[PDB]
Amino acid sequence: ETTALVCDNGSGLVKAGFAGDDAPRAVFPSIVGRPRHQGVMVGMGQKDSYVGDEAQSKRGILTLKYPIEHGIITNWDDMEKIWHHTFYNELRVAPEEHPTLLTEAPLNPKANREKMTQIMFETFNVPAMYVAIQAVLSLYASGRTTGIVLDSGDGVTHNVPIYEGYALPHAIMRLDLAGRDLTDYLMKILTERGYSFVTTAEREIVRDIKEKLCYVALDFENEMATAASSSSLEKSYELPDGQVITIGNERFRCPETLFQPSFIGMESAGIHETTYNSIMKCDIDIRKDLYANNVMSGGTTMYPGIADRMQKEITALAPSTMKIKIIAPPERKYSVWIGGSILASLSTFQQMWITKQEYDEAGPSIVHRKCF
């Protein structure tokens, strides 16, 4: 028939695919490269700029721009290259023929969702589209109608409580801490051990170090005492050139900043306290049922041990009589996409789409009133 496309713009990975299947088939970094060097060989097929997996194949010679910083799209012209590459090259499906579903963080400038709509109608002639909140989609992806979703990707972290399918707008918390800022801190702590990663290529190398070797200490203080007192933690990793670099307490110490943003100088408390302070903004009849489900979403949650650290220290904050249950499916890195895949295939959703008719009638202003 026709099937919606489902896209999650994110930062770092873009992930896209068809509605009503199990996993995205286009997953690639949202990264744009331009050559900076003198080009020597005549007759190369020299190419102006590179997108996605190509830019990380050639990264040694490229500046890498991320077009999305903290869920805001800062550079539009390079964003359009990413979308254009997604539909034509990665999916090989013309956007005129498919509805499209787009994903965003809450509490961010409305001009962003306006212009994101305008491009889809005017440049791609997408027949219809919708913009959905990442948190909401994580619940569809985990099979609940009730829970408080803690979501952190690259860029923005946000909590949204939901109870029987009603969001509670006054309780939404947003925090910029997650994602790249872990890596931009890790590069500083690695400098203490005499390695220096300056370039945007080296940033991607640190981004791989973090994914391989970092983990969260259940008690932070005893594991610093131990790794000070012994080498037994120490693990070593091979750089792209065959050098080998060795990392000790830094590898737990970097994700710990999620729980103490004082390390990087951020103003406000770590995700346990923003999750608890979010539940405290909810009327007292539902707190039991939010404490009973906490759904972790997006890639930053993947650090080993983070679930047990959360569950422990929230059980320290909460009153003792309640069950705190932390829910962290192993697939959670994809949850926002899987939840959009479920949502876009519901029959009830076929009235929700913004159609081109309504955009042409009322202009991009429509998004705010028709969408959440």
């Binding site: 903290h70 800062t74 400038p109």
Partner: peptide, 7 residues
């Protein structure tokens, strides 16, 4: 962003 932050 536009004010309180770089984006």
């Amino acid at each position: 962003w536009x004010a309180x932050c770089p984006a």
